[PDB]
Design a protein around this ligand. Structure first.
Ligand SMILES: Cc1cc2nc3c(=O)[nH]c(=O)nc-3n(C[C@H](O)[C@H](O)[C@H](O)COP(=O)(O)OP(=O)(O)OC[C@H]3O[C@@H](n4cnc5c(N)ncnc54)[C@H](O)[C@@H]3O)c2cc1C
Ligand SMILES: Cc1cc2nc3c(=O)[nH]c(=O)nc-3n(C[C@H](O)[C@H](O)[C@H](O)COP(=O)(O)O)c2cc1C
Length: 603
């Protein structure tokens, strides 16, 4: 009841404000401070009149204590606060070593002992081992300064507390703009970036060598549905690289710089209120830094959103944080800051609402209608639009001037009822051969057919992971057509169904007919027949091939399939080689080192 440490603990207080007051001024300001403590840190504050407690347990109060105290005699406390005074003056060395406090005394210089109470108190607190945080305040009612004396003191202690308690004050946007807006409302189109990636006008000029910094614009020669079913769209594209001088081999990847859907970009401009044809630059406030801009400038908002900015993936923590100020509806602003937080609770609301719902920026704007930022701050915060990679599905020996892509279109419904569209694949799908140009480049990999033709090859490529092997098979067929003896060429393919999603049914059957493909092993899942079982089934034969210097290749979207396939090979070497599992793994390791076990797995 009168035990101050007891009462503080019982009631789960984060912070204690005490006051001693004859005529209500200290009480008033102790209350004003408490109110500000809560408004800014959302603490659970007790604010109590010293007169109502015994203080023998002052040292056991486990929160920070503010003390407001008035002077009334010979530097005495108010007569009602006798018990509080008798404790502070009797306090022996070390008695209050756990007490962390701040203090604001109330006095009047027109009396003999200006602020004697708070001055005495502080001598005794520190003498007994307590640590004061911040300055000792001393209101002067004699000068008429008390309110401003408090104002100054309060601002001070709140800065001290911001570090002591961690955290930031509600009502604060420590928001740092990295770049600055300049509107180029007059400038000629030749100086303005139009969606090209490196040097200005490079999509026009097109001079070798083409690469990541300078992609070749390849015409789309073919674009056909590969699959029988309607659930999914899987497609085969052909990219004309005639006159590029780009060299590739089977096993290489082709990278592609897509465009965002223009309808999406429009919808975005319409909800931001922004006119997107405004050409502009975002110049770095760090004048001496390397990145002068977040993306090629001068450029229009339409262009940045279309070609240089990622607007489809879930925005990150820091972009929610920075957008939160632009939410006029307070409860919408609370959401965003919470989702931007380091809180277990906030992180978790973020994962499900932002990440798991796959909410892109437009979706966040639409569902938080009071969030209305300026386009230029948004463009600064959004991540860069990345290139997208595909396993070339052609051999350069039959298609030297053509690069083939095999891809499933990403198109799916979210928890929140939206339909999301994968950028590159829907873009590629909309490319009609009747010119339609795809910015691209080739990155070399170490995924290669054996250069010694007689060497057997074992390809494991379920689903879209057949991609690289289509080119491997074209190539091997080609080697046979040229008079070379070619070793066995085994494909272990997989899909759901033969009349739904059998990729390259004609071509693989025909390559098999012509003897180019020695074996087409398909594992249609739809009872759960995956490729692992086909490998185990054919284990006896696979071990001969392996022992005969065969090369193994694993391709596909799923890391687990690769892992299951590797495990299956571990068991085959274990059984048929007659060795310990540990030796089996080390054998397959040796293969990898020799370059006879290669992977192309995309996660
Ligand atoms: C080296 C390499 C080679 C590759 N080769 C090929 C290839 O030959 N063929 C191929 O098909 N892929 C391949 N991949 C993937 C390919 O690069 C693209 O990521 C893919 O085509 C999707 O791109 P997008 O722009 O259409 O989708 P994006 O706009 O990038 O969206 C893809 C994202 O959407 C999300 N997503 C997808 N489906 C769902 C779902 N149903 N529910 C919720 N979220 C979902 C995922 O988070 C995924 O990261 C390869 C990857 C790498 C790294
Ligand atoms: C009778 C009386 C004695 C006072 N003695 C002092 C004093 O010794 N030193 C001082 O600085 N102020 C003195 N004051 C000023 C008070 O401390 C000042 O008015 C203060 O704001 C009172 O706060 P409170 O309303 O919480 O009691 C005195 C005021 C009165 C009314």
């Amino acid at each position: 009841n009168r035990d101050i440490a007891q009462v503080v603990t019982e009631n789960n207080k984060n912070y204690l404000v005490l006051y001693a007051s004859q005529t209500g001024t200290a009480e008033d300001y102790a209350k004003k401070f408490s109110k500000e403590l809560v408004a800014k840190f959302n603490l659970n504050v007790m604010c109590a009149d010293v007169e109502n407690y015994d203080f023998e347990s002052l040292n056991d109060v486990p929160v920070i204590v503010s003390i407001f105290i008035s002077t009334y005699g010979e530097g005495d406390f108010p007569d009602g606060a006798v018990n509080f005074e008798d404790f502070i003056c009797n306090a022996e060395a070390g008695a209050l070593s756990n007490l962390r406090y701040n203090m604001f005394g109330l006095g009047n210089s027109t009396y003999e002992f200006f602020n004697g109470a708070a001055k005495k108190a502080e001598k005794h607190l520190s003498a007994a081992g307590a640590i004061r945080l911040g300055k000792l305040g001393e209101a002067d009612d004699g000068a008429g300064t008390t309110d401003e004396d408090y104002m100054a003191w309060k601002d001070s202690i709140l800065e001290v507390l911001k570090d002591e308690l961690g955290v930031e004050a509600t009502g604060e946007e420590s928001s740092i703009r990295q770049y600055e807006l300049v509107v180029h409302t007059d400038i000629d189109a030749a100086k303005v970036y139009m969606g090209e990636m490196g040097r200005l006008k490079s999509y026009e000029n097109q001079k070798p060598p083409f690469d990541a910094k300078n992609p070749f614009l390849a015409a789309v020669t073919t674009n056909r549905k590969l699959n029988q079913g309607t659930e999914r769209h899987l497609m085969h594209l052909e990219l004309d690289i005639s006159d590029s001088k780009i060299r590739y081999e089977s096993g290489d990847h082709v990278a592609v710089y897509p465009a965002n859907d223009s309808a999406l970009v429009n919808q975005l401009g319409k909800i931001l209120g922004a006119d997107l044809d405004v050409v502009m630059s975002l110049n770095n406030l760090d004048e001496e830094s390397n990145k002068k801009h977040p993306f090629p400038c001068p450029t229009s908002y339409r262009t940045a959103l279309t070609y240089y900015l990622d607007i489809t993936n879930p925005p990150r923590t820091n972009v929610l944080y920075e957008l939160a100020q632009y939410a006029s509806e307070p409860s919408e602003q609370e959401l965003l800051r919470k989702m931007a937080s380091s809180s277990g609770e906030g992180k978790e609301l973020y994962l499900s609402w932002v990440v798991e719902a796959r909410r892109h920026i437009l979706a966040i704007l639409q569902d938080c209608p009071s969030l209305r930022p300026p386009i230029d701050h948004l463009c600064e915060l959004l991540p860069r639009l990345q290139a997208r990679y595909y396993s070339i599905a052609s051999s350069s020996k039959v298609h030297p001037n053509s690069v083939h892509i095999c891809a499933v279109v990403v198109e799916y419904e979210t928890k929140a009822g939206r339909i999301n569209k994968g950028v590159a694949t829907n873009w590629l799908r909309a490319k009609e051969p009747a010119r339609a140009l795809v910015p691209m480049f080739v990155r070399k990999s170490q995924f290669r057919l054996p250069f010694k033709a007689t060497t057997p090859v074992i390809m494991v490529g379920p689903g879209t992971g057949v991609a690289p092997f289509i080119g491997f098979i074209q190539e091997r067929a080609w080697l046979r057509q040229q008079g070379k003896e070619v070793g066995e060429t085994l494909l272990y393919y997989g899909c759901r169904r033969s009349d739904e999603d059998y990729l390259y049914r004609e071509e693989l059957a025909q390559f098999h007919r012509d003897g180019a493909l020695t074996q087409l092993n398909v594992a249609f899942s739809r009872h759960k027949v995956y490729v692992q079982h086909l490998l185990k089934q054919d284990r006896e034969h696979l071990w001969k091939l392996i022992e005969g210097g065969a090369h193994i290749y694993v391709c596909g979207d799923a890391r687990n399939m690769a892992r299951d396939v590797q495990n299956t090979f571990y068991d085959i070497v274990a059984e048929l080689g007659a060795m310990e599992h540990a030796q089996a793994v080390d054998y397959i390791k040796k293969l990898m080192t020799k370059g006879r076990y290669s992977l192309d797995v995309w996660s």
